[PDB]
UniProtKB/Swiss-Prot annotation, chain A:
Domain of life assignment: Eukaryota
Residue ranges for the DNA-binding region feature of this UniProt entry: 26-49, 77-99
Domain HTH myb-type positions: 1-51, 52-103
Role noted for this protein: DNA-binding protein involved in cell cycle control. May act as a transcription activator. Plays a role in pre-mRNA splicing as core component of precatalytic, catalytic and postcatalytic spliceosomal complexes. Component of the PRP19-CDC5L complex that forms an integral part of the spliceosome and is required for activating pre-mRNA splicing. The PRP19-CDC5L complex may also play a role in the response to DNA damage (DDR). As a component of the minor spliceosome, involved in the splicing of U12-type introns in pre-mRNAs.
Oligomeric form and interacting partners: Homodimer. Interacts with DAPK3. Component of the precatalytic, catalytic and postcatalytic spliceosome complexes. Part of a spliceosomal 'core' complex consisting of CDC5L, PLRG1, SPF27, CCAP1, CCAP3 and CCAP6. Interacts with PLRG1, Lodestar/TTF2, and NIPP1/PPP1R8. Component of the minor spliceosome, which splices U12-type introns. Within this complex, interacts with SCNM1. Component of the PRP19-CDC5L splicing complex composed of a core complex comprising a homotetramer of PRPF19, CDC5L, PLRG1 and BCAS2, and at least three less stably associated proteins CTNNBL1, CWC15 and HSPA8.
Bilayer-spanning residue ranges: none
Subcellular location field: Nucleus; Nucleus speckle; Cytoplasm
Protein's name in the database: Cell division cycle 5-like protein
Swiss-Prot record, chain B:
Biological function: Component of the 17S U2 SnRNP complex of the spliceosome, a large ribonucleoprotein complex that removes introns from transcribed pre-mRNAs. The 17S U2 SnRNP complex (1) directly participates in early spliceosome assembly and (2) mediates recognition of the intron branch site during pre-mRNA splicing by promoting the selection of the pre-mRNA branch-site adenosine, the nucleophile for the first step of splicing.
Effect of R42K: Does not affect methylation by PRMT9
Full-sequence portion shown in this chain: 461 to 689 of 895
Disulfide bridge positions per record: none
Post-translational modification Symmetric dimethylarginine, affected residues: R48
Mutagenesis or variant effect for F46A: Does not affect methylation by PRMT9
Organism (species): Homo sapiens
Modified residues (Omega-N-methylarginine): R48, R55
Changes after translation: Methylation at Arg-48 by PRMT9 is required for the interaction with SMN1.
Phenotype when changing Y50A: Does not affect methylation by PRMT9
Name assigned to this protein: Splicing factor 3B subunit 2
Consequence of changing R55K: Does not affect methylation by PRMT9
Swiss-Prot record, chain D:
Part of the whole protein covered: 112 to 222 of 1217
Stretch list, region Interaction with SF3B1 and SF3B5: 82-111
Domain comment quoted from the record: The core of the protein consists of three beta-propeller domains.
Function: Component of the 17S U2 SnRNP complex of the spliceosome, a large ribonucleoprotein complex that removes introns from transcribed pre-mRNAs. The 17S U2 SnRNP complex (1) directly participates in early spliceosome assembly and (2) mediates recognition of the intron branch site during pre-mRNA splicing by promoting the selection of the pre-mRNA branch-site adenosine, the nucleophile for the first step of splicing.
Gene, per the UniProt record: SF3B3
Listed name of the protein: Splicing factor 3B subunit 3
Residue numbers spanned by region Interaction with PHF5A, SF3B1 and SF3B5: 34-57
Quaternary state and interactors: Component of the 17S U2 SnRNP complex, a ribonucleoprotein complex that contains small nuclear RNA (snRNA) U2 and a number of specific proteins. Part of the SF3B subcomplex of the 17S U2 SnRNP complex. SF3B associates with the splicing subcomplex SF3A and a 12S RNA unit to form the U2 small nuclear ribonucleoproteins complex (U2 snRNP). Within the SF3B subcomplex, interacts directly with SF3B1 (via HEAT domain), SF3B5 and PHF5A. Identified in the spliceosome A complex; remains associated with the spliceosome throughout the splicing process. Component of the spliceosome B complex.
Curated annotation (Swiss-Prot), chain G:
Gene designation per UniProt: SF3B5
Region spans: Interaction with SF3B1 and SF3B3: 1-62
Principal location: nucleus
Name this polypeptide is given: Splicing factor 3B subunit 5
Residue pairs linked by disulfide bridges in the UniProt entry: none
Record function comment: Component of the 17S U2 SnRNP complex of the spliceosome, a large ribonucleoprotein complex that removes introns from transcribed pre-mRNAs. The 17S U2 SnRNP complex (1) directly participates in early spliceosome assembly and (2) mediates recognition of the intron branch site during pre-mRNA splicing by promoting the selection of the pre-mRNA branch-site adenosine, the nucleophile for the first step of splicing.
MF GO annotations: RNA binding; splicing factor binding
Amino acid sequence: IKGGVWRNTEDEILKAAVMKYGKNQWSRIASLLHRKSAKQCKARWYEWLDPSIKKTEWSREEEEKLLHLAKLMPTQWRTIAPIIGRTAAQCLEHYEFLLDKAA
Amino acid sequence: TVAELKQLVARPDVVEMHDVTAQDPKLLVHLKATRNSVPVPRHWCFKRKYLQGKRGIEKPPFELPDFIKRTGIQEMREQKTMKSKMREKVRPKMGKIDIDYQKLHDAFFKWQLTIHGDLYYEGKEFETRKKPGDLSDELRISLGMPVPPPWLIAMQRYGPPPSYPNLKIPGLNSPLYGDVFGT
Amino acid sequence: AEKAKAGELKVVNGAAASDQTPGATPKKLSSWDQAETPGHTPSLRWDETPGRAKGSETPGATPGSKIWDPTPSAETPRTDRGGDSIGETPTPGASKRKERNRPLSDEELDAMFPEGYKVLPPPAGYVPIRTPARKLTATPTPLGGMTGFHMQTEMKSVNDQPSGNLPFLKPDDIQYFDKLLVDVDESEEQKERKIMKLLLKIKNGTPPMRKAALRQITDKAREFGAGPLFNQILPLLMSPTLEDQERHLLVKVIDRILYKLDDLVRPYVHKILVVIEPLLIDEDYYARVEGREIISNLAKAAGLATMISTMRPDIDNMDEYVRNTTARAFAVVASALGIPSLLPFLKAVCKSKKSWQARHTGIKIVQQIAILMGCAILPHLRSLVEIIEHGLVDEQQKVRTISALAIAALAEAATPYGIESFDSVLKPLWKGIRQHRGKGLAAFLKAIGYLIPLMDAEYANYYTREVMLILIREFQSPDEEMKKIVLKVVKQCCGTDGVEANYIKTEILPPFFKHFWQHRMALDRRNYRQLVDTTVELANKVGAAEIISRIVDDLKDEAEQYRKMVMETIEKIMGNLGAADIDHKLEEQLIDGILYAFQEQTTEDSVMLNG
Amino acid sequence: CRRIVPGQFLAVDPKGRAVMISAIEKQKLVYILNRDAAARLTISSPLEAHKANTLVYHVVGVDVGFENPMFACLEMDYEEADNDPTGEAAANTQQTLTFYELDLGLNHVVR
Amino acid sequence: DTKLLILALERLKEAYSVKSRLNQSQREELGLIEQAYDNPHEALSRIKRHLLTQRA
Amino acid sequence: RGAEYVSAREWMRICFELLELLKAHKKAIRRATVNTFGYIAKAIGPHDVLATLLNNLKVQERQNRVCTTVAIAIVAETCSPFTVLPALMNEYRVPELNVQNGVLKSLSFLFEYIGEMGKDYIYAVTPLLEDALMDRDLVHRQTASAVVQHMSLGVYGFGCEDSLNHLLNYVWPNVFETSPHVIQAVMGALEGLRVAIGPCRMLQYCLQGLFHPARKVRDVYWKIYNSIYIGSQDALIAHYPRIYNDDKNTYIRYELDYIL
Amino acid sequence: QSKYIGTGHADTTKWEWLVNQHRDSYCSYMGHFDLLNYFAIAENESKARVRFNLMEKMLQPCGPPA
Amino acid sequence: DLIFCRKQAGVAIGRLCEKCDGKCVICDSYVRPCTLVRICDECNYGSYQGRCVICGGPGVSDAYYCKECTIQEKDRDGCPKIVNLGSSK
RNA sequence: AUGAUGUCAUACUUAUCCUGUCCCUUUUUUUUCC
Ligand SMILES: [Zn+2]
Ligand SMILES: [Zn+2]
Ligand SMILES: [Zn+2]
């Protein structure tokens, strides 16, 4: 019931709240938003909104590295994602994109 | 023809641009000039939906009638922590306003706009009712003249203004009391 | 105007040429009773009934011969029903001469499936396998066969409805919404059907999706047109798996789009009603008031002649179901467009000489008009009676039964007024009261029952005293229809101011409490209520202490529902008459009864308490 | 004082059964009168004679002893005059005398 | 399929059967499981979709 | 009934408990609630309790705020509003908008309940309606217009019409809009203003709009003119102006020009 | 509204509006005893003949339409 | 879907149930009950005897008009018994 | 310097809503025997 799509208003307010309160207090930040919980706010920070996350096309090196590693440790995305420096969901989407466009 | 249609009316000025497209101009000409009737508001043919917040952001929030101001309620109304609010329930204090029922039986009895020829439209506030011959107080103060404003001395020499030809200003062709030195 | 009789032979010849339909002809001639009033309106209505093309030809030639004589003094639709009944006679006949599994033809095959599919032979040989398959369904099933699996290591395509969201599809609804599943996009009408899947958003999804979708499709009515919509809806509202809610919602979208579309719906009217008429007969009440509403909006939305010319072939349809629900349909449309507009149609129908089923239908229509319109029948009551009267004497039975029943419904909505309008109806009815066995008898008793309050206490004195005999004798029949009728009768006959107490006290009350008060009745609902009312009125006449005094002992009876019944009865009685009449001892039995019954309560309800 | 609202013209039956009230145009109403159980006067519910676009010159009660009451309404129709740009319907249009019949049993008022 | 889904859902419901006011996350769990009873085929399709796709 | 047996402290606690009973999903609950709140308002007296009403956060929509508004009304009745108004009118100042339209509603229900007594307070409310009716946002025009309505029915026949004409000026531009609630509001407004001011002035605002070239203006001014027309059709006669006669038709009614 | 005679709309013609206000004026004249008597005084006739001429002018006034 | 029947107003008194009891019909308000409701027996008959003018339950009281609708004279129009745009039952 | 098209989003309105409600769907080849 609480779950749903993320909104620009909720997302910007999440930016400001994280800026003010700090990274380790989630319950305080979930208090301001409506229809969202603390877990969802944290994972929403570290998954997507976090500025340290790299949003752009993958260079050739990152594709070589991603393919090699994914053939090295099948199906493990949370181990690979830090090694290439990208988000697990992102490198997943890009992998299915490489097999999708490869044929 | 919008030209010749203007010869059939006592006050043909009433005829306007879109008026010539009317389904019955030969009447509307005679109605719109009816004695005491009032014009249609002008906000249509403006697509702006009757208002914007340009001039409306500089307005005061509100100001009370003097009869309500002398009463003294204004100072009584004016902050609280949450636990003080649940204390305000447990403690509670009575009689914060403590109004004088004599006073509020007094003001609205003992103590206590526009005519029909006017109607409001979107942007109009002050202007029509600063004109040639009519100025505000303070600018009188900067001017510093005791109870003509002195450049209507030069409106003697150089002539009546092109911009407001209908002009009359006191003492010249306009034979004045308080602020308003021309009409 | 005798040349409107021989002229009826002429018109019969011409229209018969342009065979045998009695209805349209009597509809044509039905304008004669206004004579010299008749006008161009006859061209309009008939325009829909026959081909609008020949319509200008026939109506034109009619006005010429009419004006001259005065001075000197859809077809395919009906063609289908005829073939339908004829095949029924062929098959039915063959068995004497001797269902959905009957073999089919390639045109019939092309009839079912929609556009864009191909028939295939792969071989002639695999086809010969399909032909031997029947023989080999027996033969090769008796032969060697089996299946097995091997252990070996191991692509998986599938489709939900993806785009952004597309709320979920039940596993069956795929058949309808399959076109949405394929993701081919962005290249005319095919894009309107494709975008029309917003239906799916109305059917299943979140409430907001249903709201916004509903509006979006409302404002696109004029755009998409009724054709594509109904083409993509009527299958859904026809779905065998349909919900309650989903049904109701599709009803809503049909309404909201039918507030706009007016002239457009004309081809689809029947195509609508076929699904909608089942709403009129339903267990749910709100479903019924909705149905009546949307048929009102449809009939008023379309034209009169549209409705009439539309709905004829369902009158003689073999199944009585469609006939019945169709009758209620005519009731609704008649409430829409008014009685006098639709009269000549009916009055033409009940005199149809083809077959009885028609007249049965039309009479049922008279009834359902009586129920629906109710109190408002009053002005045309006379003409209506003048229609229906000819069926009471008919050789067929049904027509007689349903006829007199319709008189009943009339009089019940006729509550007292217009007595003389029923006048000519009486003398046969009373006579029939003598000679009848079975349901028709009870029906007459229903009619006469609702009539008697409308007569004069002098004439109704005699007539009533005659009815009382049969009324007595007939208490004992096991028929529950019977018991309902004779019950309400006893209310009206014996609740008459012109009836004597002692006569009721002796003749009636003992058999009344004997046969009627039993545990068959109370368990039923209607019988419960009506019984309550009748007993209440008998108390209203003979007095209080009698009735109560006889039914007190039953407060202590085992079953609840029975106790509930006598309890609410005592309640209403002592409500009206007052407790002053009650003596002492019976009052002891009262208070003890009421406490005792109150001490055992299986369910929570007011009846015991208010009591 | 209205165009369509009754009270203008007033008529009543010789036997006092039903009183008929009428406006100048479009509305002619009837109240039926019967004394109560105590022989004190009780008034019924109204009825409606409504006839579209019809001017009523005068209304007079009519004598029918213990019958369905009759009423004499002078009428005229201007609907002929409004749709006749020539002005012929201004002339050649005669005021229609119509007798309405109240009917107790059918409890409506028919032309 | 319905058999299996039913069993599993009952199993999950069994941990909370005593059911004090619980908490927020638990509340989400009861409401979502309860959802699964009303529209099972939805839940089954969503599940098979996860099993075919999500690796994170 | 009794109300003396209990000390005031208990009462005011009852108040602060009653405040959140207005979350009820049922209408009869709120009913009894507001009426009680009036009773205890009599048991104590106005100022404190109406202040406790003005405390309200307004936080949710209807479901309800406006019930508190009703309490402000009935409280203003139970002891003379002749006392209470200045507090409210001051509390329109607050920059928070939804409570501004709140106190507008309070005036609406207020005049609806007071009726005749508004023969005085009309003046007090007049300039504030000017500020409100002059539009910050549509709800101001709407609610204020409703106030003009109930005021207009209430004051009828007592001779205050002038200021009502002034307010009618500012009412008049709002005639045009497609929003259902504001257009039906304005309709009720101009109907009450019809009966209070008299038709003549109305019609003098409604003449020119009838035949104006545009379709919009004709749609509306004809809707208005119908509203003015159905009621008081008898009294309109005098006010139809003189309209000259053309070729085929005589548009002068000469009966009025017969002079003795 | 429609069944209420005198109802206007956006397409309303001059002729219809003025013939309306005419007929309504005449119903007022039939209505008020005095004003009627004023008319009888000014132009000398019976009350009757006045009302009769008015009832003649009910359908016509302004004459034929356009 | 829900609108007045507007048949001619008779002498029959209006009947409101528990729910609708206090409401003036048209203004939807509880204020100043003054005059009385009249509807035709065409709208009020039979199962409608003592029926609610609105919901269809038994009438426990009689509707009174406000003073607002009084001066605007709306109480004089056709019988204000709401009919759903299906039947009335 | 506010046009059109978008299933983004949030505020807001209506003393609207949330408890009323089952009562004429009873449809079949007439068929209850001193
Ligand atoms: Zn009615
Ligand atoms: Zn109710
Ligand atoms: Zn009201």
